[PDB]
Amino acid sequence: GNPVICLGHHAVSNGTMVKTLTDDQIEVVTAQELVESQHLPELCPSPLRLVDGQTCDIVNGALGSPGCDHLNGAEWDVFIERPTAVDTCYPFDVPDYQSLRSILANNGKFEFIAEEFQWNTVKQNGKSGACKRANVNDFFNRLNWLTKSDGNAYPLQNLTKVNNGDYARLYIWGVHHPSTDTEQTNLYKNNPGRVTVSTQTSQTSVVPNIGSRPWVRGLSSRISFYWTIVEPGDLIVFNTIGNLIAPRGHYKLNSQKKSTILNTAVPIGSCVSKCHTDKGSISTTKPFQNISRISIGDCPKYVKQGSLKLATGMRNIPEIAGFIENGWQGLIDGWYGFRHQNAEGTGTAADLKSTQAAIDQINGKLNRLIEKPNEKYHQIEKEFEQVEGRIQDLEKYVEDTKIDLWSYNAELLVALENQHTIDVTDSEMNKLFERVRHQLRENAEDKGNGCFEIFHQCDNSCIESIRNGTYDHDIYRDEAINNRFQ
Amino acid sequence: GNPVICLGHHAVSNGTMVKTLTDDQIEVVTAQELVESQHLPELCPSPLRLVDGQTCDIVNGALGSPGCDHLNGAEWDVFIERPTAVDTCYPFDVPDYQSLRSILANNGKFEFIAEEFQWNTVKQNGKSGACKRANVNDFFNRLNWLTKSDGNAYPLQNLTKVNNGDYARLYIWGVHHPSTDTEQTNLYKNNPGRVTVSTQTSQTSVVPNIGSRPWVRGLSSRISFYWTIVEPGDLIVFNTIGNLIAPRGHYKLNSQKKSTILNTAVPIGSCVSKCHTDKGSISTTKPFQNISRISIGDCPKYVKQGSLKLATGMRNIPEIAGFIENGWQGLIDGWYGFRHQNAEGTGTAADLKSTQAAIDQINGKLNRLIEKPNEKYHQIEKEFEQVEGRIQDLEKYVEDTKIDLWSYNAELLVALENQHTIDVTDSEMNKLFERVRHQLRENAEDKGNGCFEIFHQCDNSCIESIRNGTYDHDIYRDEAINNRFQ
Amino acid sequence: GNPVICLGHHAVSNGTMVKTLTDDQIEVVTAQELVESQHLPELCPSPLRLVDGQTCDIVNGALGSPGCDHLNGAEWDVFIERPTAVDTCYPFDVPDYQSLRSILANNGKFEFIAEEFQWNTVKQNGKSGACKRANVNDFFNRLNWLTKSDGNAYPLQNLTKVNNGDYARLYIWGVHHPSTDTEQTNLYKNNPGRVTVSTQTSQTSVVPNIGSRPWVRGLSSRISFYWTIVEPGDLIVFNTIGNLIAPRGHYKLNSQKKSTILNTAVPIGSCVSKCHTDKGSISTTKPFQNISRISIGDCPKYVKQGSLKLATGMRNIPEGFIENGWQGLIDGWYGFRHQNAEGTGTAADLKSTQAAIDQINGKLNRLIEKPNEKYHQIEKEFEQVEGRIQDLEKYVEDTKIDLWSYNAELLVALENQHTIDVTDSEMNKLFERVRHQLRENAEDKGNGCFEIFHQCDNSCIESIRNGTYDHDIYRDEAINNRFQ
Ligand SMILES: *[C@@H]1O[C@H](CO)[C@@H](O)[C@H](O)[C@H]1NC(C)=O
Ligand SMILES: *[C@@H]1O[C@H](CO)[C@@H](O)[C@H](O)[C@H]1NC(C)=O
Ligand SMILES: *[C@@H]1O[C@H](CO)[C@@H](O)[C@H](O)[C@H]1NC(C)=O
Ligand SMILES: *[C@@H]1O[C@H](CO)[C@@H](O)[C@H](O)[C@H]1NC(C)=O
Ligand SMILES: *[C@@H]1O[C@H](CO)[C@@H](O)[C@H](O)[C@H]1NC(C)=O
Ligand SMILES: *[C@@H]1O[C@H](CO)[C@@H](O)[C@H](O)[C@H]1NC(C)=O
């Protein structure tokens, strides 16, 4: 005969490379980036409740150093701690520092309950030139520096507090470390001193350390802070013959501990986001991010890859003939379509049903990549100033392992998605072609290039009947059969 | 040019929604749940060896507290520790309690070897009103409370035990802390006392802490317990001038520790199962469970999902015409089938080569799926009464991380399986169609809807020859061609 | 119409079983093992830097014990610690030994920087019979044992070292624990002694514990060792009235610690490899290994599986509705088998074969792509039980190995099912490519053979195989033989 109908698919001048199981660069018409690499320049104060430490890290917040008054009564989902935090009080350290920091941050509030402690015969409310408050010598406002009396006495202290409330209590207490033996006896009479804090099932006892040390805020002495949790029904004893930095009460512990801490210089802005990193919040719908392993809230999974491209279109093939060799750059209002050549000339029209089928499957894939919120809050430290050994080895190894596994998952996921997407769109093309083959029945012959040679005169109107499925092959059959075989 | 034979597949009234990579809800004929949500109200005492602590926790078992005698000589894969266990002996604490408990649990037995310690001049076998056995004062039966002689003497003790055997020895010993100086001298004469326990490479020196503890069951005196492991070829030394709570021997350590502990109130039953949780045993062949992260033995992976349905059958399309886009609800003795209409009438017959090819490919998925061990005994603690800091944060993070990784694995796997199953069953339908097409050769024409218009006369005789593959096309070729093209 | 043309695929006498999502046993033509099970009987000294401790473990190397001098100035990616290392000096303990060992190992070098400490009036360079060099009393050569002068004098020592360099400093110092009070006053005059070491950001003090320990190398006394890190800008104060075992300088810390330690008896050889285990180096391109969970460098992932076979060819069918495969076909994967008047024959199609070959090579190189290098990890074997921290360390590693073993199983199954589907798809594509070359001049026998309904000599048979055969020329002849 001579009128020809072709089936084919769209194509663009320049597409995007994606990966599959079998190769790392297959060009497809459209693609979607799955790794978020952009963050906001600020931290969003909504909807998570953020509290800014400003000059106070969370530990001198609990101790009550000068400049930390704004944190009294505070409640947070995320405590924002500044790397710029400045010391304003007595030089201290904290054995197992990170555990106290963790407990304070996880707890999520500063609610202090003043208690009267009947210390006997010793001086109270010791103050320091290294801890000026409102330009006067002062001290941590949650702590009480006991010293020997003017009569030169420091008798054994032995105070019990019973937890008969309905919440667990957190006591913070310290041990003072003088610079010389002379200082030890000048302050506490007894040498050595001893600080002992006991519950029903535990006991921390500390012998003070004596010796000259580097000047810190003018001083060679130090305080080491410790803490004790007291469950309801439990008791705590404070027992000393010297060097106790006494609590003035206790912090309330929440039963549910759901909060956390983020150490970052990034300012708090006005945006809205439930995902925070140390580099700023993230506002995205992508499932992965390469911005930071440190993240909090409703977040994308951290991976090592800078880019993972999800195919959102069929394979892109460059350019009458059908789909067996090429794609059609001219087809721009559909994914698949008909190209014809008859007496009245040529033309191209899109096929809606096959185009809509391929699009629905791709959107389906996209929606499935929207995971339900898997909100994470208190996790583990992921950056460290200096080496510590065993426990830090374990922490870095855990995070390193986790990241490798998720990066693998991401990599395999997009390869599998893309392989299927390509097969799905290849399959929609062949089904379109099969549909028409069966429409034409014995009236036409498969040319092999995705085109049917039709063996009867075919109108522009006869073409239209083929494309909308009203073509009745019986009408043309007699004529067609003997155009074909004779 | 009149008979029609159609190929199709079964369909049911109400299928089951499953998931693929592309779809959140696609309907299949049958499906299998992969997440176990049901557990037994009991713990199964076989094939794992369970020991019921009953009234004693495992640490009290090791010390030999009153009420713990049933544990003498016990061996276990899993020690069942009851939440209702109470302290019945002398008030004690254990500095690294969690680790002592873990070591005892992991070791898997209470095999005590008595040793005679030739203590000099001190009284042995001290007993107490705080540790009654049958309303008579007693003590931990693995421990030996040394006190001063009637002659008011507590001479230096210096006793050595060399390990010349072939296993490592666990020694448990304690230090007693009196309430007052008077109690100290009444018991041990010397004040202060000291206890020093050494091996070749290690030394533990404890100075008692007098009068710094709150009351427990009316006593503010307390014992602190320690442990020492002695490798073969090594030795242990006990050196004390007071307050030593001496061991009566040592426990044997198993160099291949593979036991653990489970804290639960769930009674031991008479079921059979290799998987235990704090909620009770699980008896299933499903590969996943959402019951508890605390599981021991040969267990299904714990996941977050409440349900993951695995398709065990083709797509369900409920409701003269073959398979192209609906299915036959009256096909019940096969998965795929022939439906015909000729002069003699109508009929449906199942094809079984096709039906079995599909079932065999599905069945294999299930056996691959429900396959190999997951043999895990001693793990880590996974629930916590109260925050502790760094190490517990790391323990929680490791577990939470593991669960997300397994939940992802479960989610993906079921989607991959279901996508494959759906392609497999679709493929089988089309292989069946192609088989018949190539049987008929030029005697029939593809009607486009999964049917063949047969252009010769065809009774029930030749219908079955089509269905059993004996149909000779050449017999009717002349008749059939004549009807096709005239 | 009776010449017949057929399309099929290669087969072999016997090939290899593989696994997919559905079956644990599907025979394919060729396959590749993805799990390395063989190691070298030695450790490769290239291209990573290995340093052999010999008789010296790393902690003694840091202290400068006899037999560790060869470690002076050493730099490593992997410190090789021998299980037969023994103590050769004063008996000592290190509180948190494992952390010191780990820091020394991770740091990756023994770059010691000597300093003059102007100790006042005390005697220096004390030696012991328990620490013999040649055959003379000696000592840890990084340490300086201070004792009272000849005039019974040990004045308070108070020495400062300021860090005005651009690297963190590691100081290792010690506290001596005498066996008796008489030994204490004999050595240090004062009783008790006191050792206090402090920076701006950390402080400690150690009161010596006087008492007898079990005899070791003729002594009941002990030294306990400590370390202190001093950052740039910080400084350190050594303050003492007795029992200090003084540093003679400090070690330099790299800002970028990239090294680790391997404890193994395996000898260092002459081979080349970038993956090391406790059982020897591994030289392989395979992505997985079942040799050891302890591995360092550029290594395959450790998995529990002994074997994971990846299909590198199509299903192997002996001797669908293609027959099975052709064993006669051995210069391609897919080909043509015909029979006309002048005889039979078989030829291989290039593209279909090459297309399948290319897609399979693609998998292989995506698989064997394989970078990221891991050095310092965690300890994975333990001599005695410890409780909590060791429990977590073992649990982490167990979890990791399970997850990766699962990944390996899933991956191979997915690749195999795809490799099979692709190679069957390429067969069927070759078929209906030919179908459209014949048009109306041939029919589908239903077994992959086209009944050519016209006289088809060797040279129309080739014409089909080069894409030239014109279906017009024989159309009338064909139709006449088909319907007549
Ligand atoms: C994330 O990836 C982008 C490009 O994909 C890259 O430019 C950026 O450096 C990456 N971010 C990090 C923190 O590596
Ligand atoms: C204790 O026994 C050990 C080993 O027999 C011995 O070396 C030491 O001198 C003894 N101590 C006393 C005080 O007798
Ligand atoms: C300290 O108080 C406890 C009870 O609160 C008491 O048992 C103990 O004896 C007291 N300490 C002294 C040295 O008396
Ligand atoms: C487990 O899943 C079932 C549904 O299959 C749900 O009803 C149940 O609440 C889940 N259990 C837990 C502990 O979440
Ligand atoms: C001890 O050394 C410190 C640190 O340099 C110094 O500040 C202090 O004054 C010294 N004390 C003396 C020399 O008595
Ligand atoms: C590794 O797998 C091989 C099988 O290829 C097996 O023979 C060998 O025992 C395995 N190695 C180990 C250490 O289990």
Side-chain angles (χ1 to χ4, degrees), chain A residues 212-215 220, chain C residues 156-160 235-239:
Chain A
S212 296
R213 312 188 183 82
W215 300 120
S220 169
Chain C
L156 183 284
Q157 306 294 304
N158 190 41
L159 257 65
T160 299
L235 49 320
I236 186 167
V237 174
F238 289 88
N239 188 292

Side-chain angles (χ1 to χ4, degrees), chain C residues 209-419:
Chain C
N209 182 281
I210 300 172
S212 269
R213 288 79 182 175
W215 300 90
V216 172
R217 239 162 280 114
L219 297 174
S220 55
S221 291
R222 295 290 190 279
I223 291 172
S224 293
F225 283 107
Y226 298 88
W227 74 96
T228 305
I229 294 169
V230 190
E231 302 290 331
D234 207 331
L235 49 320
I236 186 167
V237 174
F238 289 88
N239 188 292
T240 318
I241 62 169
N243 302 72
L244 174 66
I245 307 300
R248 293 184 182 274
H250 62 270
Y251 281 105
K252 322 221 310 183
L253 296 173
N254 295 317
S255 299
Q256 298 275 283
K257 319 203 162 54
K258 287 155 173 340
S259 296
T260 191
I261 183 169
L262 180 55
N263 190 293
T264 175
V266 176
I268 301 186
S270 41
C271 54
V272 183
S273 169
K274 224 186 166 181
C275 182
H276 308 296
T277 72
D278 51 330
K279 308 211 284 207
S281 299
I282 307 178
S283 197
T284 200
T285 41
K286 308 186 181 43
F288 309 129
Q289 55 103 1
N290 77 327
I291 296 177
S292 188
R293 71 177 56 197
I294 299 185
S295 63
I296 300 167
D298 199 352
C299 290
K301 288 118 164 153
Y302 181 72
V303 299
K304 300 208 303 299
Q305 292 102 322
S307 181
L308 287 172
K309 277 155 157 42
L310 179 83
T312 46
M314 71 191 62
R315 211 157 147 194
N316 181 64
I317 338 283
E319 259 316 294
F321 228 102
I322 286 107
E323 175 208 3
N324 272 173
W326 305 333
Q327 332 203 1
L329 185 53
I330 36 63
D331 57 316
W333 290 18
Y334 311 98
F336 303 88
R337 186 182 295 275
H338 64 256
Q339 146 180 7
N340 59 354
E342 19 190 19
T344 61
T346 295
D349 186 40
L350 206 43
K351 166 163 324 307
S352 62
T353 290
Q354 182 66 17
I357 287 267
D358 285 331
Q359 289 183 61
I360 278 180
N361 286 341
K363 295 185 171 201
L364 295 171
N365 281 84
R366 278 232 68 196
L367 268 302
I368 77 105
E369 206 24 60
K370 80 140 279 178
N372 200 322
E373 51 287 5
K374 318 301 227 177
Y375 288 63
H376 201 53
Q377 297 154 68
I378 62 176
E379 298 298 323
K380 294 174 182 185
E381 283 176 342
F382 304 88
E383 164 214 322
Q384 199 45 264
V385 301
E386 286 175 288
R388 202 176 176 163
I389 293 163
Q390 184 184 131
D391 289 343
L392 182 54
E393 285 165 334
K394 273 143 80 175
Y395 185 67
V396 173
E397 188 66 11
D398 266 335
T399 304
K400 169 179 172 171
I401 293 165
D402 269 17
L403 289 164
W404 274 117
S405 291
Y406 175 85
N407 285 345
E409 193 84 37
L410 181 57
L411 179 49
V412 176
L414 287 179
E415 296 279 16
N416 285 349
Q417 192 92 73
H418 184 252
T419 281

Side-chain angles (χ1 to χ4, degrees), chain B residues 33 35-37 290-291 302 304-307:
Chain B
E33 173 62 63
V35 175
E36 186 52 69
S37 67
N290 77 324
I291 293 158
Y302 179 66
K304 308 211 297 285
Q305 302 91 325
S307 167

Side-chain angles (χ1 to χ4, degrees), chain B residues 83-351:
Chain B
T84 44
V86 276
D87 287 318
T88 69
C89 201
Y90 205 90
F92 65 86
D93 53 40
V94 187
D96 219 304
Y97 188 94
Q98 296 92 311
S99 274
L100 172 53
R101 181 176 176 271
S102 172
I103 288 178
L104 290 170
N106 193 27
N107 186 53
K109 72 195 179 163
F110 285 152
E111 187 171 357
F112 200 76
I113 310 300
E115 285 184 280
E116 197 186 51
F117 284 82
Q118 293 210 249
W119 305 110
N120 175 271
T121 304
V122 292
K123 251 184 198 160
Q124 306 186 34
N125 308 298
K127 325 261 212 184
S128 166
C131 185
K132 287 166 182 300
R133 210 178 299 263
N135 231 47
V136 177
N137 296 4
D138 195 348
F139 202 62
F140 310 94
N141 62 32
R142 307 307 197 189
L143 279 320
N144 182 2
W145 192 349
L146 314 185
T147 55
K148 73 182 191 186
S149 74
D150 289 335
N152 202 24
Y154 194 122
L156 183 268
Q157 309 294 318
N158 191 45
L159 255 43
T160 294
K161 300 293 194 185
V162 166
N163 186 351
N164 288 316
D166 50 25
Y167 61 86
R169 301 168 169 178
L170 174 74
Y171 287 86
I172 298 172
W173 50 276
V175 181
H176 184 255
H177 310 266
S179 286
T180 64
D181 289 325
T182 296
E183 178 186 354
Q184 170 76 27
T185 61
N186 281 359
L187 285 170
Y188 313 115
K189 177 54 204 45
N190 312 315
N191 188 10
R194 35 150 292 277
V195 179
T196 311
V197 178
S198 313
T199 62
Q200 252 154 213
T201 63
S202 81
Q203 180 176 270
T204 312
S205 204
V206 189
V207 182
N209 211 303
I210 302 174
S212 51
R213 288 173 160 88
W215 308 279
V216 177
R217 288 165 260 135
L219 304 200
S220 56
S221 297
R222 209 154 294 156
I223 296 171
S224 285
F225 282 117
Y226 302 86
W227 73 94
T228 307
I229 298 187
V230 182
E231 300 292 336
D234 199 339
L235 64 306
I236 185 165
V237 184
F238 292 87
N239 190 297
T240 178
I241 57 170
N243 299 69
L244 172 61
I245 302 303
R248 291 185 184 273
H250 64 265
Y251 283 102
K252 309 199 31 171
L253 291 177
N254 201 287
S255 57
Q256 324 302 130
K257 330 214 154 52
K258 55 195 136 200
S259 301
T260 191
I261 185 161
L262 183 64
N263 194 291
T264 178
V266 172
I268 297 169
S270 59
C271 50
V272 173
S273 179
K274 214 165 176 181
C275 178
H276 309 292
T277 79
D278 60 323
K279 309 284 202 193
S281 300
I282 310 177
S283 197
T284 187
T285 55
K286 296 186 188 67
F288 313 115
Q289 52 101 1
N290 77 324
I291 293 158
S292 186
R293 71 186 54 198
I294 305 167
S295 80
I296 302 164
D298 190 346
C299 279
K301 279 115 204 179
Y302 179 66
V303 298
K304 308 211 297 285
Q305 302 91 325
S307 167
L308 291 164
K309 281 157 156 48
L310 173 84
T312 56
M314 64 181 61
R315 295 176 59 191
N316 188 47
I317 318 106
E319 73 181 292
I320 324 194
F323 73 89
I324 268 295
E325 320 199 337
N326 69 340
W328 304 332
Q329 251 163 172
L331 182 59
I332 68 184
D333 65 324
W335 280 23
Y336 311 89
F338 303 75
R339 182 175 287 166
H340 67 71
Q341 177 156 32
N342 64 350
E344 199 147 21
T346 84
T348 311
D351 190 76

